[PDB]
Design a protein around this nucleic acid. Structure first.
Ligand SMILES: [Zn+2]
Ligand SMILES: [Zn+2]
Ligand SMILES: [Zn+2]
Ligand SMILES: [Zn+2]
Lengths: 620, 190, 586
RNA sequence: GCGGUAGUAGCAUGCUAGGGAGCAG
RNA sequence: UGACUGCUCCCUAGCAUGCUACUACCG
């Protein structure tokens, strides 16, 4: 906290990797043997050898991921398009990347029009398209890191909020695992820069044996390895016309972050009935179970949701450090005290402030999160819980204590002030008491910066529980953003669920004998997915009939909506599926002579196959 | 599947038993036929099953070892490629200015952000518009980072040559404006 | 892990584990080699050893395959499968083998621990890849033998031409002269530091090297054993006499360096190789120099076998050929750096086979075939792939330092493949013109091996002397001494005034060191001392045993001196063959 | 007379591996 | 040029378990 304030005086060219000259068989290299953080000060590597013989495979991998050689063997660059610090240009040309439009499925559009759709004055219309971008879009989108400013925190209050958050994250287990227990799916994805010139992640997960991976992972508990992050543009459907960009992290960072965090990440995504709902599905009655869990037994229930403007470009560094420290608290037996600090330093040097490669040039990332590391959503959930806790603390500590009728709450406020500003060490009894109070009067359900809260209403009116105004104030003074209350909702009737959670609305329908909650999407999104595709081979329905089956699975609960076009969407999808099947069979029987059969294929255009996906019985 | 060790015995016993049956002998020979053929087929059963299990096991082993060999070959070639890339990028370090600024350090360590700033030979500037252009690289030589640079070439967003005589206020709206200027260090490195 | 087997050239994945060089063996070949020989270890992509925990068996005929690993009789699962069956080992490409019948000779090559003459007989009597494998494993075993020696513990130095140096405990004194190079590396605190390329004189330690270092503490003199790389090209390429002179350009004029050099070119321009069959000082030097300007537009390579024999390699090249046309290749040991190092484009490169800048040519010259093995021929054929080349050298010279053989001497037919290639079908070239030499060597080596194709060019005044003295031999260490040399040098310089400035052939280098300590004569090496001979030389007794005197060590020693060649009859020599003047000692 | 065992065929259930596709943060 | 997770549908291959069936052996 003090280093953050003091680092704003010193010049910005004295931060980052520290390099020196080493000799390998009489030839000189330039490698990084330390780091200078704005928050953590000066860090020196522990195992550095100047004179050495011919190097091995993992040394080659480490030296090929360091930005030192790439920056030192490049040209100077002065870029006036952005205000962020610039390092070097790797080539003699600047690359401009564009985004192409979508492909039009005319047959589906004609079929939909021939059934009374897209008429004037209708309540269902297309507002999801593929937007195109011009040459200078990647740099324009990268220039949004100017909203990240150095922020000092109230340390005596953060040191209590972190205890409450750790109490929230208490029902799991974690630790370190060996290289043979790591689970990777889709090994056919990119490996980052400069490793994308020779293959995908399969090549590097096959060429490296198990003890090589173990030695590489054990190397990062005594040294710091800075890497390079590549920025890519997305090609997907959306409702707004701004460019979207994701970050491609290097393989040397992901390979070790998996071994560090995967056990805890898998343990979190396997628990039901907790605050974090990552891993729970919405089919087979999952949505109803989540909604019933979040309602708990609150006394005067209302519902509330909020929004984070520029969530990843504006999150201060201190909260990211806090999230990493909270996640790394499960290593009390497998790791020493220096190993944990060096792991934290490696994480900070790789995914918090490092060189990014936009276009064909190297830039310096000021701060924030790089969406695309191995621990994105869980860290976002920790950050969301931290913000909710500090909002509750600010709401309770800023109330006239002479007007609180209940004496228990008055004593709670007195003890809260004493534990914040008059106590130096942790007091577990009051932490447990405050955690119980929060869980009784303020219930949460969190999924990576999306949240729904069921709170006591009279307590919030009297000021003993956080409100929207408290969230606005906390965001203003701790996140450097303004949160307009036009993107937040409030629901005073519990028979209708949250107004929006994970882009889905909620309706209470009668199925069987009882009443359950079902989610339904926006009809415009489903129709836009039907009519606008990436690829040309998806404008011929017979080649892929399984797209429309999934799209009709997503659009089933629209048949219980009181509005009439909403069910017509599902019926139109079923008729199109039947038409595509008939087209395929006849269109194949005609020129060729192969005769097709309709055995157990009619299930796809009858509603009973889709009705079974929202009824609690858990198949496959 | 036809020349198994027990096949000869099984077939010979079957042929002899069926010849005895075709001889029309008493029921005792028929009972002996039935017992002998039953036990013969029973003993042929495992000899026909175990061999088929073993062949599939051997085939799986061969496939696994082949894929291991392919993985090793790929590892060797990627190692060669990485070594070549490193040794190729080594040859542009300008080993006199770099040595001159390394020796001035009190322990050999220097920040990475000041190596291109003091040892690079070429500079690239990207200019949004003309107002920014006339404040940064006006003329033929300009000063930046406490050094003197002289212009060598100017291209546009389409990578076509542009002469400085036509970068004016009137002619500004006729150029693909993300201009890229290339300069050399004067009196120092190139 | 995948390649061709040394006999069938078929694809395999099996490596024999009981052969020091780990050759690639075909599955049927693997079975034949493992059955008829106590070579019971086979390597694959994974080793063929029992993986049962706590177990240790390294056979191949004993293991059973089960599950995914390999198991033995004591741990075979119910689902087991023997690896060694059907006379064919289990490995990749098992269905695309052809086998071979040359397994007995391959077994003999593999099993031969290199003891007797038959070792080299069968080394030179086999098919091509077996020749390559035998040469590789011969150099491997000799380098292992010489690395099985101690480290020269040195902590101080007296002065120049003096040294105190100690070997290890249980290790004997290594061989003496530069034939076994002494190149060591000391340590200061953390790594190794340079010492110098040296060689020792006696046991007083004079320095016959070419540098002087601040030698004292922590010094480690060692005969550096080097890892041997595998061969690529065969020992020789079968020649075919061309009709077109492709690339070769006989100039309009005649660059008349030598007269018969025109015929030289005439028959070396068409066949894929040749050889300069040169008696000492008989055009063995500058015929290539004449070829340099008669064929100036031809890429011409020059090489030898040792860094010592570069005299004629380097002198006349700069002496008469143009300055720029020459080029120098030297690792950086101490040798002639007269031309330009670090130059890839040139038409006349002069070096040794130690290290060259990888390129191909169309004309090469290669010196010192007598002490050249098939390994050196293969490496020069691999590094340089040319159209024609000449191997300078003569069978009437010394063999390579093949200290491996002890029973039978290695004769001309056993030098290398080429050295008998020109012995059976005849030499590519045969000269008969001695540049500067009386007819003593003419008579001697023409009655012995030259078949009298060269005759008297310079007159025979019979000033050379050979006496009736015999000598007495005594062994002390791996070098011996001679009392009828300590006394005999004086007894032979008693009154004859002509051989006081003669050169001392050294069958025993320690004896030459003692002679230098007592009376004083220059030390003259035997093997790598051709062309360094002066005008006047003494052939001394120095031995009677089978160390040096059967035929081919004195064929060049008789040519060291020109007029006054004192070659006394030492032992069972070629006494009753010629006429020689004699003076009886008092 | 009943049971056990050994193969063979059809059917059902849950995992692992491979491929194609959909949604969400 | 194509990041990190979560859930779901379809197709094929293998393994394990269970149900039924057909012969044969044994008591
Ligand atoms: Zn740990
Ligand atoms: Zn062997
Ligand atoms: Zn073979
Ligand atoms: Zn065993």
């Amino acid at each position: 906290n003090f280093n953050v304030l003091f680092s704003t005086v010193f010049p910005p060219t004295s931060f980052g990797p520290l390099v020196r000259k080493i000799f390998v068989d009489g030839v000189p290299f330039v490698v990084s043997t330390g780091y200078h953080f704005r928050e953590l000060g000066v860090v020196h590597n522990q195992d550095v050898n100047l004179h050495s013989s011919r190097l091995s495979f993992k040394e080659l991998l480490v030296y090929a991921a360091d930005p030192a050689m790439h920056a030192a063997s490049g040209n100077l660059l002065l870029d006036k398009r952005t205000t962020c610090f610039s390092v070097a240009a790797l080539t003699n040309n600047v690359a401009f990347q564009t985004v192409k439009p979508g492909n039009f499925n005319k047959d589906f559009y004609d079929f939909a029009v021939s059934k009374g759709f897209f008429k004037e004055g209708s309540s269902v219309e297309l507002k999801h398209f593929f937007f195109a971008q011009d040459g200078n879009a990647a740099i324009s989108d990268y220039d949004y890191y100017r909203y990240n400013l150095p922020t000092m925190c109230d340390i005596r209050q953060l040191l209590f909020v972190v205890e409450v958050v750790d109490k929230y994250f208490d029902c799991y287990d974690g630790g370190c695992i060996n290289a043979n227990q790591v689970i990777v799916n889709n090994l056919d994805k990119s490996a980052g820069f400069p490793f994308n010139k020779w293959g995908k992640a399969r090549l590097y997960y096959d060429s490296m044996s198990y003890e090589d991976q173990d030695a590489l992972f054990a190397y990062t508990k005594r040294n710091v390895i800075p890497t390079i992050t590549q920025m890519n543009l997305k090609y997907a459907i959306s409702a707004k016309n701004r460019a979207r960009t994701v970050a491609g992290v290097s393989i040397c960072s992901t390979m070790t972050n998996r071994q560090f965090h995967q056990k805890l990440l898998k343990s979190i995504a396997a628990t039901r009935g907790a605050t974090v709902v990552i891993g729970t599905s919405k089919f087979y009655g999952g949505w109803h179970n989540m909604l019933k869990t979040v309602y708990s037994d609150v006394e005067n229930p209302h519902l509330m949701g909020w929004d984070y403007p520029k969530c990843d470009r504006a999150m201060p560094n201190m909260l990211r450090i806090m999230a990493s420290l909270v996640l790394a608290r499960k290593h009390t037996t497998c790791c020493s005290l220096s190993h944990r600090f060096y792991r934290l330093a490696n994480e900070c040097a790789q995914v918090l402030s490092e060189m990014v490669m936009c276009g064909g040039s190297l830039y310096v990332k000021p701060g924030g999160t790089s969406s695309g590391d191995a621990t994105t959503a869980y860290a976002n959930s920790v950050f969301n819980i931290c913000q909710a806790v500090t909002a509750n603390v600010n709401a309770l500590l800023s109330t006239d204590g002479n007007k609180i009728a209940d004496k228990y709450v008055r004593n709670l406020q007195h003890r809260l002030y004493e534990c914040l500003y008059r106590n130096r060490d942790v007091d577990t009894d009051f932490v447990n008491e405050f955690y119980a109070y929060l869980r009784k009067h303020f219930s949460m359900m969190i999924l990576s910066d999306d949240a729904v809260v069921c709170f006591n209403s009279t307590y919030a009116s009297q000021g003993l529980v956080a409100s929207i105004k408290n969230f606005k104030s906390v965001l203003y003074y701790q996140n450097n953003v303004f949160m307009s209350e036009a993107k937040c909702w409030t629901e005073t009737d519990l028979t209708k669920g949250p107004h929006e959670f994970c882009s889905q609305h909620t309706m209470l329908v009668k199925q069987g004998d009882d009443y359950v909650y079902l989610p339904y999407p926006d009809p415009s999104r489903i129709l836009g997915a039907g009519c606008f595709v990436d690829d040309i081979v998806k404008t011929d329905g017979t080649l892929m009939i399984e797209r429309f089956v999934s799209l009709a699975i997503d659009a089933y609960p629209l048949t219980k909506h009181p509005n009439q076009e909403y069910a017509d969407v599902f019926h139109l999808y079923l008729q199109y599926i039947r038409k595509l099947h008939d087209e395929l069979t006849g269109h194949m029987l005609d020129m060729y002579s192969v005769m097709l059969t309709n055995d157990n294929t009619s299930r796809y255009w009858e509603p009973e196959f889709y009705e079974a996906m929202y009824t609690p019985h858990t198949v496959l | 599947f036809s020349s198994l060790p027990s096949y000869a015995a099984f077939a010979t016993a079957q042929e002899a038993y069926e010849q005895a049956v075709a001889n029309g002998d008493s029921e005792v020979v028929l009972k002996k036929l039935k017992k002998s053929l039953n036990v013969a087929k029973s003993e042929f059963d495992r000899d026909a099953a175990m061999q088929r299990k073993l062949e599939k096991m051997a085939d799986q082993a061969m496939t696994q070892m082949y894929k291991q060999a392919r993985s090793e070959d790929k590892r060797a070639k990627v190692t060669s490629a990485m070594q070549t890339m490193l040794f190729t990028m080594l040859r542009k370090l300008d080993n006199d200015a770099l040595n001159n600024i390394i020796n001035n350090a009190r322990d050999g360590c220097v920040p990475l952000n000041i190596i291109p700033l003091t040892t690079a030979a070429k500079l690239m500037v990207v200019i949004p518009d003309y107002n920014t252009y006339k404040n940064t690289c006006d003329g033929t030589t300009f000063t930046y980072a406490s050094a003197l640079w002289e212009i060598q070439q100017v291209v546009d967003a389409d990578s076509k040559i542009v002469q400085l005589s036509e970068i004016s206020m009137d002619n500004s709206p006729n150029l693909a404006w993300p201009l890229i200027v290339t300069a050399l260090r004067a009196n120092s490195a190139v | 892990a995948v390649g061709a087997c040394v006999l069938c050239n078929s694809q395999t994945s099996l490596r024999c584990g009981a052969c020091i060089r780990r050759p690639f063996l075909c599955c049927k070949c693997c079975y034949d080699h493992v059955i008829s020989t106590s070579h019971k270890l086979v390597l694959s992509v994974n080793p063929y050893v029992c993986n049962a925990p706590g177990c240790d068996v390294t056979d191949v005929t004993q293991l059973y395959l089960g599950g995914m690993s390999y198991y033995c009789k004591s741990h075979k699962p119910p689902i087991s499968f023997p690896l060694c069956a059907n006379g064919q080992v289990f490995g990749l490409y098992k269905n695309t083998c052809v086998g071979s019948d040359n397994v007995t000779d391959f077994n003999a090559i593999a099993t031969c621990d290199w003891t007797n003459a038959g070792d080299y007989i069968l080394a030179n009597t086999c098919t091509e890849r077996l020749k390559l494998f035998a040469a590789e494993t011969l150099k491997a075993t000799e380098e292992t033998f010489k690395l099985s020696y101690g480290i020269a513990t040195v902590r101080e130095v007296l002065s120049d031409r003096e040294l105190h140096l100690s070997w290890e405990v249980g290790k004997p004194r290594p061989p003496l002269n530069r034939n076994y190079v002494f190149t060591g590396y000391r340590v200061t605190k953390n790594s190794k530091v340079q010492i110098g390329e040296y060689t020792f004189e006696k046991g007083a330690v004079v320095y016959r090297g070419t540098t002087t270092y601040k030698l004292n503490v922590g010094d480690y003199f060692v005969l550096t054993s080097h890892t041997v790389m595998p061969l690529s090209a065969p020992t020789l390429v079968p020649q075919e006499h061309y009709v077109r002179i492709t690339g070769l350009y006989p100039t309009l004029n005649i660059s008349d360096e030598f007269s018969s050099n025109v015929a030289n070119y005439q028959k070396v321009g068409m066949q894929k190789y040749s050889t300069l069959q040169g008696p000492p000082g008989t055009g063995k030097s500058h015929f290539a120099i004449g070829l340099a300007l008669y064929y100036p537009s031809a890429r011409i390579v020059y090489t030898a076998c040792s860094h010592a024999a570069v005299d004629a390699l380097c002198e006349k090249a700069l002496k008469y050929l143009p300055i720029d046309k020459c080029s120098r290749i030297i690792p950086a040991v101490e040798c002639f750096d007269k031309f330009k190092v670090n130059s890839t484009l040139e038409q006349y490169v002069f070096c040794t086979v130690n290290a060259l800048p990888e390129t191909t040519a169309d004309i090469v010259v290669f010196d010192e075939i007598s002490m050249a093995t098939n390994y050196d021929l293969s490496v020069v054929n691999a590094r340089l792939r040319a159209k024609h080349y000449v191997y300078i050298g003569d069978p009437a010279q010394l063999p390579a330092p093949r200290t491996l053989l002890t029973k039978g001497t290695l004769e001309p037919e056993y030098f290398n493949s080429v050295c008998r290639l020109m012995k059976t079908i005849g030499p590519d070239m045969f000269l008969g013109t001695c540049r500067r030499c009386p007819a003593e060597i003419v008579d001697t080596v023409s009655a012995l091996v030259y078949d009298n194709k060269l005759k008297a060019h310079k007159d025979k005044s019979a000033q050379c002397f050979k006496m009736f003295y015999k000598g007495v031999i005594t062994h002390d260490v791996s070098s011996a001494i001679n009392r009828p040399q300590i006394g005999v040098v004086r007894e032979f310089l008693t009154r004859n005034p002509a051989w006081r400035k003669a050169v001392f052939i050294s069958p025993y280098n320690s004896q030459n060191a003692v002679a230098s300590k007592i009376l004083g004569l220059p030390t003259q090496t035997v093997d790598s001392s051709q062309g360094s001979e002066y005008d006047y030389v003494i052939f001394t007794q120095t031995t009677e045993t089978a160390h040096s005197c059967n035929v081919n060590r004195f064929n060049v020693a008789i040519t060291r001196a020109k007029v006054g060649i004192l070659c006394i009859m030492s032992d069972r020599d070629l006494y009753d063959k010629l006429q020689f003047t004699s003076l009886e000692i008092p």
